[PDB]
């Protein structure tokens, strides 16, 4: 579904990887090129040794994975941050 790949707006990678999958999905097409498209859409480190490719394994890759960053920790509303100072009228 599109909910894992929304329209990026600033002025998707998985959509482009699926487009490179469907660009080889023809009857006169080898299983090796479709297999390579499926692999580099799912996990590029199976056939390569490069990082920074946004694939599926990016949500479970290291410290910056999805659970550690957005599930057991999050950015919140009704928050504030400021320098501290002492007070003698404050117990």
């Amino acid at each position: 579904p599109l909910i894992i790949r929304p329209a990026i707006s600033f002025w998707n990678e998985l959509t482009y990887l699926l487009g490179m999958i469907v660009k080889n999905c023809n009857l006169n097409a080898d299983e090796q090129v479709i297999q390579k498209a499926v692999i580099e859409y799912d996990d590029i480190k199976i056939i390569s040794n490069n990082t920074t490719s946004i694939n599926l394994s990016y949500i479970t890759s290291g410290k910056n994975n999805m659970i550690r960053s957005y599930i057991v920790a999050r950015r919140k509303d009704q928050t504030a941050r400021s320098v501290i100072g002492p007070s003698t009228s404050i117990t």
């Binding site: 009704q78 928050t79 941050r81 320098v83 501290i84 100072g85 007070s87 117990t91």
Partner: protein, 792 residues
């Protein structure tokens, strides 16, 4: 409040490791009604007053209020208006009984406001200590008055004492002030000139003695020492000079406080804040020897560190000993060695911060699911870890480390006390029998409820025993379900309420045991996150010790167990294919000597030999003239050296034929003569033999550490000790020890050999005590977290 800053109280500052030098803090507002109730009750700072492991108060006073507390206790002969000016808004209910002149002890008696007793601190509300120091008012200290006031009633009384005490100390600072000037530190040049002359006399004495030794070696009147022993001798002389500087600084502090008794620097030294004789030695005396990796700075190119010294300079000041102080000002080389130590500490804390964070997260995620269940047991998942939480089924902030009183035959019921001590006396001798336990765990602070009483009004002696025995039996049945040993509680109540040393009333005993049942009934509850609390306390402590550089590296002759975070991480890593430090303790030294001879690495080259060869028809002959004092310093014999050379030459491939003879040249020389013919090509094999001969002719397991046989005094009990000999070997397996007569020898291996021989419970025990030993001296309260980690 005003401004754009979040204004916190200073009393919580030490709880958050916070300074007001640019620290930021965050806020979140969670306005859900369940969260509102939990914030109002569970996360309120009155609820969190006592620390959850060692029970000391989390809030208290800081730098200026310590000296204000000290000087407020020492003040005398005040009017009623001066006392009421110091008290301020808390002078409303101050009662002058019939007095017209008051002291600071009366102010403290009003501030405490309870007639409680405590050994060494309080008696009927008055402070019977000599001075009020930082152990009384600073947070996380074992002698806090707020901790005693909250042990007496509740956390509201301790938080009220903290608020009222901080107000009164700041009013003392407003009326009287506190400042340290330069005249308190260095009023004139007399003492610093005297210590400068003392240092420049003694270091030239050290240099002339070392030069006399070097010239006696150089002309040949004595045989040279090893470089380790020579470094140890110079290390001892410079340490003696440092201790002489320390004693001079201490005598100057004594003479200054008997000449000028109102010195503010010595006032904050006596109050217990950050001034000691070592810091005053750094300012006024000497800066000492600068250590990198436990040793001085290593020699680079040309046998020196800096080009300010000659090549291969034996000057100890050029290896990092600083003669100047901060008052005189460090010179260029001294500033190099000081900056070397400073930048090394900065690099080490930067390199260790991320490792401490990674281990802290691993331990927190492992231990976070371990809780106290509804029956007082510590469980994780469906596995019972402990039968009783904190060994008491009471909160750890309520539990009190009390003095362990060894059985004396002047006690009332010495028979019952000695029977309980024979039951529980194991575990009180620990640390490979080196240490005897001085503290045990009272279930709560019952010492504040003990009042002394004359023997006519006291409870009867047999009735007090019946009360203690019936309460402990009822508790052992109803609260611990007859599966936990709580004989330590009965031992505490029998020795601390002993009629041979203290008599109490009947209502005092009733009050004590009713408070005991109240702590057993109300304090500990199911769902207490004991695992994540213990994990956070252990993690915060090793992070503080890593970022504070608390564990100094030091080198010794034997192999020792390391201290600090990397040893803690090696313990929790549990790596298999690594060598372990295996300790052998024995009453007789012959069994340790037989293993020490066979396992300690000695090569021919470290014996400093004189090896010279010459070619002859039919044979290449090699003369090895060794010195006998070198053989005695290695603690071997000449036959050992002969066996080393014979084993290497008789088993080597490059030697075709050989023959060995032993000549006597002196009582200072032994000539091992070898006749040789090498396998062709004999010239290349000759050069390879002459290259590998001082190293390959060796014996024992190859290690950088030697095996010196130490000795100490070990405990069989509190009253009986014995002299024990110790030995440590770096060793992978335990197999090669199996050829020796190791009977009546205690053997302490690492974790995996303890598991593979003794089992999982001995592995748990080793992990507990070894993880506790990495924190250092003075951290026994981390025993109960570490056990909770080891049992996981």
């Amino acid at each position: 409040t005003e401004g754009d800053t979040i204004k916190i109280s200073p009393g919580i500052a030490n709880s958050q490791n916070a300074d007001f030098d640019g620290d930021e803090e965050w806020m979140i507002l969670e306005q859900n009604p369940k969260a509102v109730i939990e914030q109002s009750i569970l996360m309120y700072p009155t609820t969190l007053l006592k620390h959850d492991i060692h029970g000391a108060p989390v809030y208290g006073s800081i730098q200026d209020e310590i000296v204000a507390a000290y000087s407020l206790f020492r003040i005398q002969d005040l009017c009623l208006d001066e006392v009421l000016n110091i008290l301020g808004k808390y002078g409303r209910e101050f009662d002058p009984k019939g007095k017209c002149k008051f002291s600071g002890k009366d102010i403290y008696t009003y501030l405490i406001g309870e007639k409680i007793n405590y050994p060494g601190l309080l008696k009927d509300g008055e402070i019977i200590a000599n001075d009020v120091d930082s152990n009384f008012v600073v947070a996380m200290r074992h002698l806090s008055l707020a901790g005693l006031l909250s042990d007496h009633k509740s956390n509201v009384e301790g938080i009220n004492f903290i608020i009222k005490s901080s107000y009164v100390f700041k009013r003392y600072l407003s009326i009287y002030g506190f400042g340290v000037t330069f005249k308190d530190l260095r009023p004139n040049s007399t003492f610093t000139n005297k210590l400068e002359a003392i240092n420049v006399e003694k270091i030239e004495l050290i240099k002339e003695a070392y030069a006399k030794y070097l010239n006696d070696v150089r002309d040949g009147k004595i045989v040279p020492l090893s470089k380790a022993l020579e470094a140890d001798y110079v290390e001892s002389m410079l340490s003696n000079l440092t201790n002489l500087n320390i004693r001079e600084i201490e005598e100057h502090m004594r003479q200054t406080l008997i000449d000028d008794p109102d010195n503010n620097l010595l006032k904050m030294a006596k109050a217990g804040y950050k001034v000691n004789p070592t810091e005053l030695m750094y300012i006024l005396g000497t800066y000492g020897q600068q250590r990198i990796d436990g040793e001085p700075a290593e020699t680079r190119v040309l046998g020196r560190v800096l080009p300010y010294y000659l090549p291969d300079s034996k000057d100890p000041e050029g290896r990092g000993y600083i003669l100047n102080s901060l008052t005189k000002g460090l010179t260029g080389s001294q500033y190099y060695f000081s900056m070397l130590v400073a930048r090394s500490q900065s690099t080490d804390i930067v390199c260790e911060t991320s490792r401490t964070g990674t281990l802290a997260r691993k331990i927190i995620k492992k231990m976070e699911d371990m809780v106290v269940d509804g029956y007082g047991q510590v469980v994780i998942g469906n596995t019972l870890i402990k039968y009783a939480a904190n060994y008491t089924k009471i909160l750890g902030s309520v539990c009190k480390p009390v003095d362990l009183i060894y059985p004396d035959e002047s006690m009332t019921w010495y028979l019952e006390i000695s029977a309980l001590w024979n039951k529980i006396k194991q575990g009180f001798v620990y640390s490979q029998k080196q240490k005897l336990a001085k503290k045990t765990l009272a279930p709560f602070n019952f010492l504040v409820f003990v009042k002394p009483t004359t023997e006519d009004n006291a409870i009867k002696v047999k009735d007090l025993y019946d009360m203690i025995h019936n309460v402990i039996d009822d508790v052992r049945e109803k609260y611990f379900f007859t599966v936990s040993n709580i004989d330590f509680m009965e031992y505490i109540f029998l020795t601390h309420l002993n009629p041979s040393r203290i008599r109490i009333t009947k209502e005092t005993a009733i009050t004590i045991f009713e408070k005991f049942y109240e702590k057993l009934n109300y304090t500990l509850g199911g769902g207490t996150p004991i695992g994540i609390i213990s994990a956070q306390v252990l993690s915060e402590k090793f992070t503080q010790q890593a970022l504070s550089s608390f564990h100094t590296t030091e080198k010794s002759g034997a192999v020792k167990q390391k201290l600090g975070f990397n040893e803690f991480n090696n313990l929790t890593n549990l790596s298999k294919n690594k060598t372990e430090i295996i300790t052998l303790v024995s009453d007789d030294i012959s069994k340790l000597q037989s293993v020490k001879i066979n396992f300690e690495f000695v090569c021919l080259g470290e014996l400093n030999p004189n090896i010279t060869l010459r070619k002859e028809t039919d044979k290449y002959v090699v003369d090895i003239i060794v010195n006998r004092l070198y053989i005695k310093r290695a603690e071997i014999t000449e036959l050992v050296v002969e066996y080393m050379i014979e084993r290497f030459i008789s088993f080597s491939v490059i030697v075709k034929e050989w023959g060995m003879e032993t000549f006597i040249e002196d009582e200072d020389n032994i000539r091992f003569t070898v006749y040789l013919n090498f396998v062709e090509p004999e010239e290349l094999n000759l050069s390879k033999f002459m290259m590998v001969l001082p190293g390959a002719a060796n014996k024992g397991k190859i290690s950088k550490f030697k095996i010196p046989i130490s000795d100490y005094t070990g405990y069989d009990d509190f009253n009986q000790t014995k002299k024990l000999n110790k030995m440590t070997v770096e060793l992978m397996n335990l197999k090669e020890l199996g050829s020796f007569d190791l009977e009546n020898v205690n053997v302490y291996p690492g974790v995996w050999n303890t598991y593979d021989i003794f089992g999982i419970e001995a592995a748990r025990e080793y992990l507990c005590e070894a993880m506790l030993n990495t924190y250092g001296e003075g951290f026994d309260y981390l025993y109960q977290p570490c056990d909770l980690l080891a049992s996981l």
